[PDB]
Design a protein around this motif. Structure first.
Motif, PDB file in Angstrom:
ATOM      1  N   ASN A 131       0.957  -1.257   0.063  1.00 47.11           N
ATOM      2  CA  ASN A 131       0.199   0.095  -0.022  1.00 47.11           C
ATOM      3  C   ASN A 131       0.784   1.252  -0.085  1.00 47.11           C
ATOM      4  OD1 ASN A 131      -2.755  -0.443  -0.438  1.00 47.11           O
ATOM      5  ND2 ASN A 131      -3.000  -1.041   1.811  1.00 47.11           N
ATOM      6  N   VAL A 132       0.456   2.126  -0.881  1.00 49.76           N
ATOM      7  CA  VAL A 132       1.171   3.484  -1.044  1.00 49.76           C
ATOM      8  C   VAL A 132       0.321   4.726  -1.564  1.00 49.76           C
ATOM      9  CG1 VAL A 132       2.977   4.725  -2.402  1.00 49.76           C
ATOM     10  CG2 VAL A 132       3.484   2.363  -1.772  1.00 49.76           C
ATOM     11  N   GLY A 133       0.031   5.350  -0.644  1.00 42.16           N
ATOM     12  CA  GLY A 133      -1.134   6.263  -0.437  1.00 42.16           C
ATOM     13  C   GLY A 133      -2.491   5.452  -0.833  1.00 42.16           C
ATOM     14  N   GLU A 134      -3.297   5.842  -1.823  1.00 44.74           N
ATOM     15  CA  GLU A 134      -4.695   5.265  -1.833  1.00 44.74           C
ATOM     16  C   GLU A 134      -4.282   4.135  -3.243  1.00 44.74           C
ATOM     17  OE1 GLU A 134      -8.113   7.167  -3.230  1.00 44.74           O
ATOM     18  OE2 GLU A 134      -7.385   7.809  -5.199  1.00 44.74           O
ATOM     19  N   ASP A 135      -3.163   4.103  -3.573  1.00 38.10           N
ATOM     20  CA  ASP A 135      -2.889   3.033  -4.722  1.00 38.10           C
ATOM     21  C   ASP A 135      -1.843   1.924  -4.135  1.00 38.10           C
ATOM     22  OD1 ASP A 135      -4.308   5.153  -6.430  1.00 38.10           O
ATOM     23  OD2 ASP A 135      -2.365   6.126  -6.791  1.00 38.10           O
ATOM     24  N   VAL A 136      -1.541   1.064  -5.079  1.00 35.87           N
ATOM     25  CA  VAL A 136      -1.026  -0.173  -4.939  1.00 35.87           C
ATOM     26  C   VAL A 136       0.219  -0.377  -5.608  1.00 35.87           C
ATOM     27  CG1 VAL A 136      -1.294  -2.631  -4.574  1.00 35.87           C
ATOM     28  CG2 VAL A 136      -2.992  -1.109  -4.078  1.00 35.87           C
ATOM     29  N   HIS A 137       1.380  -0.733  -5.076  1.00 36.81           N
ATOM     30  CA  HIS A 137       2.639  -1.098  -5.604  1.00 36.81           C
ATOM     31  C   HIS A 137       2.539  -2.763  -5.974  1.00 36.81           C
ATOM     32  CE1 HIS A 137       6.458  -1.856  -6.896  1.00 36.81           C
ATOM     33  NE2 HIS A 137       7.085  -2.419  -5.773  1.00 36.81           N
ATOM     34  N   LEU A 138       2.625  -3.189  -6.981  1.00 36.41           N
ATOM     35  CA  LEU A 138       2.478  -4.530  -7.405  1.00 36.41           C
ATOM     36  C   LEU A 138       3.508  -5.350  -7.762  1.00 36.41           C
ATOM     37  CD1 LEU A 138      -0.584  -5.995  -7.174  1.00 36.41           C
ATOM     38  CD2 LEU A 138      -0.263  -6.224  -9.652  1.00 36.41           C
ATOM     39  N   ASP A 139       3.684  -6.467  -7.207  1.00 32.11           N
ATOM     40  CA  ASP A 139       4.886  -7.505  -7.642  1.00 32.11           C
ATOM     41  C   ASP A 139       4.293  -8.714  -7.875  1.00 32.11           C
ATOM     42  OD1 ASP A 139       6.869  -5.347  -7.260  1.00 32.11           O
ATOM     43  OD2 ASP A 139       7.010  -5.880  -5.130  1.00 32.11           O
ATOM     44  N   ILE A 140       4.618  -9.246  -9.104  1.00 35.60           N
ATOM     45  CA  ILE A 140       3.976 -10.462  -9.619  1.00 35.60           C
ATOM     46  C   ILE A 140       5.244 -11.371 -10.082  1.00 35.60           C
ATOM     47  CG2 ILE A 140       2.129 -11.589 -10.906  1.00 35.60           C
ATOM     48  CD1 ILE A 140       1.014  -9.078 -11.435  1.00 35.60           C
ATOM     49  N   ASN A 141       4.999 -12.699  -9.805  1.00 35.28           N
ATOM     50  CA  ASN A 141       6.159 -13.453 -10.569  1.00 35.28           C
ATOM     51  C   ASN A 141       5.203 -14.573 -11.148  1.00 35.28           C
ATOM     52  OD1 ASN A 141       8.314 -15.986  -9.765  1.00 35.28           O
ATOM     53  ND2 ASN A 141       8.693 -14.450 -11.110  1.00 35.28           N
ATOM     54  N   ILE A 142       5.478 -14.831 -12.422  1.00 33.87           N
ATOM     55  CA  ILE A 142       4.744 -15.788 -13.480  1.00 33.87           C
ATOM     56  C   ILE A 142       5.984 -16.879 -13.554  1.00 33.87           C
ATOM     57  CG2 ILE A 142       3.095 -14.375 -14.443  1.00 33.87           C
ATOM     58  CD1 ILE A 142       5.167 -14.051 -16.798  1.00 33.87           C
ATOM     59  N   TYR A 143       5.407 -18.085 -13.799  1.00 36.56           N
ATOM     60  CA  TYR A 143       6.135 -19.255 -14.249  1.00 36.56           C
ATOM     61  C   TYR A 143       6.041 -19.312 -15.818  1.00 36.56           C
ATOM     62  CZ  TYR A 143       6.113 -21.465  -9.538  1.00 36.56           C
ATOM     63  OH  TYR A 143       6.500 -21.914  -8.256  1.00 36.56           O
ATOM     64  N   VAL A 144       7.174 -19.373 -16.475  1.00 28.58           N
ATOM     65  CA  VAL A 144       7.280 -19.709 -17.924  1.00 28.58           C
ATOM     66  C   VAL A 144       8.220 -20.987 -18.147  1.00 28.58           C
ATOM     67  CG1 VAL A 144       7.012 -17.176 -18.357  1.00 28.58           C
ATOM     68  CG2 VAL A 144       9.089 -18.267 -18.511  1.00 28.58           C
ATOM     69  N   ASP A 145       8.118 -21.338 -19.330  1.00 32.83           N
ATOM     70  CA  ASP A 145       8.942 -22.562 -19.678  1.00 32.83           C
ATOM     71  C   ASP A 145      10.421 -22.058 -19.602  1.00 32.83           C
ATOM     72  OD1 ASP A 145       6.433 -23.272 -20.404  1.00 32.83           O
ATOM     73  OD2 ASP A 145       7.061 -24.283 -22.268  1.00 32.83           O
ATOM     74  N   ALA A 146      11.456 -22.765 -19.209  1.00 31.64           N
ATOM     75  CA  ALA A 146      12.645 -22.808 -19.062  1.00 31.64           C
ATOM     76  C   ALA A 146      13.360 -22.608 -20.420  1.00 31.64           C
ATOM     77  CB  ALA A 146      13.249 -23.953 -18.179  1.00 31.64           C
TER      78      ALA A 146
ATOM     79  N   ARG B 286      -0.040   2.232  -8.489  1.00 26.65           N
ATOM     80  CA  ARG B 286       0.975   3.329  -9.026  1.00 26.65           C
ATOM     81  C   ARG B 286       2.023   2.787  -9.778  1.00 26.65           C
ATOM     82  NH1 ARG B 286       5.927   3.374  -7.111  1.00 26.65           N
ATOM     83  NH2 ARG B 286       6.408   2.380  -5.002  1.00 26.65           N
ATOM     84  N   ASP B 287       2.404   1.312  -9.634  1.00 31.10           N
ATOM     85  CA  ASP B 287       3.506   0.626 -10.593  1.00 31.10           C
ATOM     86  C   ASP B 287       3.432  -0.681 -10.646  1.00 31.10           C
ATOM     87  OD1 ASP B 287       4.278   0.862  -7.860  1.00 31.10           O
ATOM     88  OD2 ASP B 287       6.328   0.928  -8.447  1.00 31.10           O
ATOM     89  N   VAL B 288       3.652  -1.632 -11.442  1.00 32.21           N
ATOM     90  CA  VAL B 288       3.755  -2.959 -11.638  1.00 32.21           C
ATOM     91  C   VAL B 288       5.145  -3.667 -12.121  1.00 32.21           C
ATOM     92  CG1 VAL B 288       2.611  -4.853 -12.689  1.00 32.21           C
ATOM     93  CG2 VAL B 288       1.373  -2.643 -12.229  1.00 32.21           C
ATOM     94  N   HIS B 289       5.818  -4.529 -11.193  1.00 29.79           N
ATOM     95  CA  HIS B 289       6.893  -5.237 -11.543  1.00 29.79           C
ATOM     96  C   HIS B 289       6.519  -6.590 -12.140  1.00 29.79           C
ATOM     97  CE1 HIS B 289       9.705  -2.250  -9.257  1.00 29.79           C
ATOM     98  NE2 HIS B 289       8.971  -1.729 -10.074  1.00 29.79           N
ATOM     99  N   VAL B 290       7.051  -7.141 -13.056  1.00 25.73           N
ATOM    100  CA  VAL B 290       6.453  -8.544 -13.511  1.00 25.73           C
ATOM    101  C   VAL B 290       7.787  -9.279 -13.456  1.00 25.73           C
ATOM    102  CG1 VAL B 290       5.353 -10.082 -15.191  1.00 25.73           C
ATOM    103  CG2 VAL B 290       4.434  -7.664 -14.389  1.00 25.73           C
TER     104      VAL B 290
END
Ligand SMILES: [Zn+2]
Ligand SMILES: [Zn+2]
Ligand SMILES: [Zn+2]
Lengths: 86, 83
Positions: A34-49, A75-79
């Motif tokens: 939580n950052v202000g009224e917005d959200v800092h988002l980190d997502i990790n996805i599985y992909v083929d090696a 506010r921002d997204v890291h994938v």
């Protein structure tokens, strides 16, 4: 002290964008800060090696673009990307 | 049900618990068909440690009891200080 009025909205919409995207074998994890009224988002996805880096860059980038464009109060997204052996 | 169910229910349990000034962050890692949950809450900086242990513990117990498909729930604490 951050107002997380939209944590639940954001987490669910992001997860659904990510889990269903091209060449994603599953979501490894998702984090919301939580950052202000917005959200800092980190997502990790599985992909083929065996996927080549340029395409995994595009895969992760498309998800970042789409979340940013479609889900409010982000506010921002890291994938990140974790290789799975299929 | 896995990630979306679990994240929303946990967040609502935590956010509304009595000496919680807000949720700092929440993390869900997929482990099988269940979810490993890490959640950090804001509490007053002057709360004594034994009471913040009880606050965090009650949230862990409640999530575990009320929210399905949850492995390990870890409930951390970040002090907020008005003054
Ligand atoms: Zn990040
Ligand atoms: Zn943990
Ligand atoms: Zn289970």
């Amino acid at each position: 002290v951050p107002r997380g009025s939209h944590m639940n909205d954001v987490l669910v919409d992001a997860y659904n964008i990510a889990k269903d995207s091209q060449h994603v074998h599953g979501v490894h994890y998702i984090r919301g800060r939580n950052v202000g009224e917005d959200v800092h988002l980190d997502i990790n996805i599985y992909v083929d090696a065996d996927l080549k880096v340029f395409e995994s860059d595009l895969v992760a980038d498309a998800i970042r673009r789409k979340i940013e464009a479609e889900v409010d109060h982000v506010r921002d997204v890291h994938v990140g990307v974790t290789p799975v052996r299929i």
